[PDB]
Every structure is written in structure tokens, then in C-alpha cells.
Amino acid sequence: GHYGIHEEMLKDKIRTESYRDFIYQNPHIFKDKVVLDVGCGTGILSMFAAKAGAKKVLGVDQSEILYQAMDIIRLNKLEDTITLIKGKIEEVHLPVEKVDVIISEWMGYFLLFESMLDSVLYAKNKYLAKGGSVYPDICTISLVAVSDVNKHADRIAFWDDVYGFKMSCMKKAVIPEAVVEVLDPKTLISEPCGIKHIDCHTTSISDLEFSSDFTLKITRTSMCTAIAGYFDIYFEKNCHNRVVFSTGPQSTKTHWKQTVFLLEKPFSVKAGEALKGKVTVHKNRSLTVTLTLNNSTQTYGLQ
Amino acid sequence: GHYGIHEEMLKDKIRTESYRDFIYQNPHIFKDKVVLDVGCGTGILSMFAAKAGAKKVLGVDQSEILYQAMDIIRLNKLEDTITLIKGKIEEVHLPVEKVDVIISEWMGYFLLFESMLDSVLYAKNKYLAKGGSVYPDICTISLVAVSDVNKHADRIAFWDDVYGFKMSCMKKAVIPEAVVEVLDPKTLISEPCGIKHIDCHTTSISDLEFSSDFTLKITRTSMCTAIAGYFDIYFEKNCHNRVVFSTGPQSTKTHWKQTVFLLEKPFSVKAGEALKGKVTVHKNRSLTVTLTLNNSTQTYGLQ
Numbered sequence A, B: 001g002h003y004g005i006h007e008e009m010l011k012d013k014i015r016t017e018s019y020r021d022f023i024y025q026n027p028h029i030f031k032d033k034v035v036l037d038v039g040c041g042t043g044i045l046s047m048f049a050a051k052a053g054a055k056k057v058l059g060v061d062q063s064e065i066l067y068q069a070m071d072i073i074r075l076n077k078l079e080d081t082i083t084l085i086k087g088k089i090e091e092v093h094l095p096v097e098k099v100d101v102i103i104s105e106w107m108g109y110f111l112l113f114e115s116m117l118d119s120v121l122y123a124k125n126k127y128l129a130k131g132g133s134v135y136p137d138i139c140t141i142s143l144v145a146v147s148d149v150n151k152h153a154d155r156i157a158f159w160d161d162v163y164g165f166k167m168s169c170m171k172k173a174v175i176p177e178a179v180v181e182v183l184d185p186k187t188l189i190s191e192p193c194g195i196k197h198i199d200c201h202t203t204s205i206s207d208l209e210f211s212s213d214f215t216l217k218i219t220r221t222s223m224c225t226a227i228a229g230y231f232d233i234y235f236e237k238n239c240h241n242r243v244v245f246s247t248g249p250q251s252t253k254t255h256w257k258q259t260v261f262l263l264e265k266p267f268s269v270k271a272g273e274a275l276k277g278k279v280t281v282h283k284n285r286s287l288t289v290t291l292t293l294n295n296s297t298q299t300y301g302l303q
């Protein structure tokens, strides 16, 4: 849509340079191939593919941004290789039956919030040639335990005394809202636990709604105040130069930051304890995350 | 609307403590009076007025937030003094003909963007008793010249080389968008110039659309890259303890920050030069700001 989204994504060096490195360092995946960029935005991924030796690149975006991409492709004299089409990938007519390669940046906060994966899976199933490839091809979601009584008090306890007046009843609107923010790695009190693994080659839309039992290996005796979620992105299939980036707190921050699920009742944990919980994701545009931990259940959404 | 707006406003200590100080330090304005809070949100201003000795406080808000205000007024046992009404101030039926005092926090970015003043002026004209008072009663808007070639390059030059590709054509979408951000006071290169003075007692809706010639007294030989706008808020009428706060860069930051209008062509200025320009504000929900400076004109809006 608005240029501000595309500025934020383009200024994410981890995001954009991971895609650039994967493409430039694996040109055999692109040489003389037909490539589809699903949600191309400004078209930077289409221009990477072009430079790595793509025969033909089809950039598709439903938003106004595609008209800026048309000027950008002309400014870079790539109009002979990159053809741009406005519309939903679900609706547009392509000047080919099949593509060799699909690339997309489809990933939302906590991977699946307001994600485009459903649109990318549609492209796969309709347009991907026999033996073709989609990138990134592998994604994981992780949870990690957090101790931060100060940030918890800033968001929750805050409402008990507001310039001398009780606003306690506000807590019930705040707890259920997941927070997208950068965590201080110092506040992590468990080993991470994988809760979801996706190969975009084999996954369906139905697999994006899932449940996982998890265990957090507690590494610090502390008050547990939150669970943080993040995702890892991998470019693996047919790569001589494989590329991974993490949106986890231990790694260089990205525009995805981390997704934080606040506990109503923080509870003490011991170094070496195996903290057992359950999480379920429902596509209930807008998706929800149900967490069971310490004999309490809360459903979280994102604003 | 959403609690997140009300959290941000409540956590603005300059904003909320200026209203608190005005009310608590001038209780003669409130003692045994009927008070209307236009857009009361969580109702904090209504609870201040109550504590300063208001006979009766009417809090009006069109949003869901009013149901949270009903619980908050009950939690603080003020339901006998504060009565809350859901609806537009323009539509609701009040259990009185006239009020003695109107209070509101109605102010938007650059004072007038997505401001509520039109709703507050309606309340004035329909409900304010003969000789009554509205607060804050006086507001000013100022411009100040900025030198910051690095922030300008971060936002504009950025688009000339994006991982080796030209995106220059993106500049025409970016320049016209005013930026709400905190300015380093060190980057100011002029004395401020007032461009607008409002008394809420006498102003009409038509006066909020205005033009002003301005002069910026340049205090530093530099490249001028932007014009910044801010506003000052005054509580004056009938006060023994008058209260002002500024949202200008020289003052403690607020959630209003400052509004920055980027120049397409930065131009050199000299210490002691009188830089002459014109500005016009049009209500063209969404309002526009036309700036003439150095023989160039640009119209800016806010996203």
C-alpha cells in the first residue's frame, strides 16, 4: 500500500540483504528461469532475480505500489526482463502457464499475523512447474520465557494508580493484546522451544492452524512475566550458499521485532526446571494464539 | 477508541499533569460548577474536576472507551458527581440546558490534524452558559527552521541508490508527507515564528482555516532542510495559577512530538538573515499545509 511500509521493509538490512545474498550467491537457481514475485512491492526482489540471470520475472502486487514499481523497473532498464501486473495473485492473468521459481516476502509478526502465505501457497499450487522451487522454503516459530517485572508493571500495574485514581478494570483489555517490540536478550530465562516447522513446498493453508505441546528449559531462577514468540527463515533447497536469519531477541533486530504475550499472573521458576505448556494458532485477516501455562489459559490477538 | 490511544495520552506527563495542575491549583473555576468534558476518554479530566469540587461533571465520548470510563468512575465512587453519556457531543441529549465550564483535550499533531476543536466549539455555542469558560482557552502555532542534511538524506537521497538500484521516482510520494517526530533542538537554525493565535472563547470553525506571512530570524549559517511546526497550550482565564506547556523541540517531548515539513531543495541561509515565507492551512477529517519559501511552494498532508 503506502510507501511507508515499503520504506520500513527496504531499510531492514537483515531482511533485504538475506534475500539479496540468497539470490546473488545462488544464481544457478535463477539463470534463464521464469520467476514469480508474489507481492513484489517496489520490485526489489524481481530486480535481484533479473540481475542473477532470470530469463523472465513476473512481479504481482494488488496495491498502487505497483505503479511505482513500473517506474522503478524502467529507471533500471529491466522492463525487457521484468513484467509487472496489478491485481490479487488469485485473480490476475499471467502471460505464462507455469513458473520455475516463486519468491516472496510474505511473513507477518509472529510469522502468521496478516501474512500473505495463503496467497503464496495459491501461486505454488496453480503456477509452479513440476520440480520447481519456492523461497524462502523453510520457516520455524519459537517461544522463549521472559522475566521483566518492570515492563510488566509499565503495562499492567500502571492502571492500578493513574494520578491517584483506580483504572484496574483496564487490565482485562490489555492482557489479551500481544505486543510487537524488541526484547532485551538479558530478560530471557529459558532456552527457546520450536513450536512449528513449515516447508512451503509441502504445507497447505490448513497446516497454518496448529497446536504444539512445548517445554521451556528454565535457565534462571526468576519471576516469569511473559512468553515471547519469533520465527526463523531459511533458504535451503538447491543452495550452495544457504541463508538463514532469525527475528529472535538474541539476533540483530528486524522490523518484525518479537511478539510478546504478557501473563496475567507472573509465577516464579527455577534454573533447570522443565516448564510445560500448550499453544494453538487459529485463523479465527486476523488470527489468535491460545497459551496454556502454569494451569492458566489465555487467548491473545494482535492489534 | 482502542485503549492504546488512551494509554499514550495518560503516559504523557506534560499533557496530563498540565491539566491536573490547572484544575487542582484553580479549584475556584470548578467549586460547585457544572462541567462538560468533551471526549472524556477514560474520564481522568472529569475525575480531576470532581476532586476540585465540581457540583456535577458530564463526560461525553462517542467511543467504546466510555464503558471503561463508567467502570472507572464507579471504582473511584464518583458516580454521584460524574455522569457519562455515549454519543457524539453533536447528537447526545444532556440532562442540563447549559454548563458553567467546558474542558477538553482536543489537540492533534500540529494542533489541527484530526483535532476535535470543531466538536468543542459546537459544545461552546450550544451549552456554555452566559459568562462561562472553556479550557484550555488559548493556543498558538509556531514554525522554526531546521538544518539536518543526514535525516534529509535518510528519507530522500535514500531512494537514489537502494541495494544498487535507482528508486528516485519515490521522492515525489515522500516530500508531501509531513513527519511527526522528535527534533534534536541542536538542529534548529532560526528563532520560532508564531503563525496562529486562537482564543477558544471567540474563535469559529472558519478561523481554523487561515494564512499567515512569517519571518524566521536565522541564528546559524547552514543548509536549511526542513520547517518544523509545533503548538503551545495556555490555561489563563480567571487563573491565580496560569499553566502553559509547549510541544516545541526546546521543551520536554510530548506524544504530539513536532510536525516536520521536508524541503525538496534544501538551500543555504546566513546567521542574521530574515527568511520570509507564507503558510496556509485548509480543511481540504484531513487538512493540508501549503508552504512558500525561497521561491518554491509545496502542499503537505499527514498520513
Ligand SMILES: N=C(NCCCSC[C@H]1O[C@@H](n2cnc3c(N)ncnc32)[C@H](O)[C@@H]1O)NCc1ccccc1
Pocket: A001, A005, A006, A008, A009, A038, A039, A040, A041, A060, A061, A062, A063, A065, A087, A088, A089, A090, A105, A106, A107, A108, A109, A114, A115, A116, A119, A255
Ligand atoms: N514484512 C512483512 N511482509 C508481509 C507482507 C506485507 S504485504 C507486501 C506486499 O504484498 C502485496 N499483496 C498482499 N496480498 C497480495 C495478494 N493477494 N496479491 C497481490 N499482492 C498482494 C501488498 O500490496 C504489498 O505491497 N510484513 C510486516 C510489516 C511490513 C511493513 C511494516 C511493518 C510490518
Ligand SMILES: N=C(NCCCSC[C@H]1O[C@@H](n2cnc3c(N)ncnc32)[C@H](O)[C@@H]1O)NCc1ccccc1
Pocket: B001, B005, B006, B008, B009, B038, B039, B040, B041, B060, B061, B062, B063, B065, B087, B088, B089, B090, B105, B106, B107, B108, B109, B114, B115, B116, B119, B255
Ligand atoms: N492528543 C490527542 N487528542 C486529540 C483528540 C483525540 S480523540 C479523544 C477522545 O475523544 C472522543 N471523541 C472524538 N470526537 C468526538 C465527538 N465528536 N463526540 C464525542 N467524543 C468524541 C474519542 O472517542 C476519544 O475517546 N490526539 C493526538 C494523539 C492521541 C493519541 C495517540 C497519538 C496521538
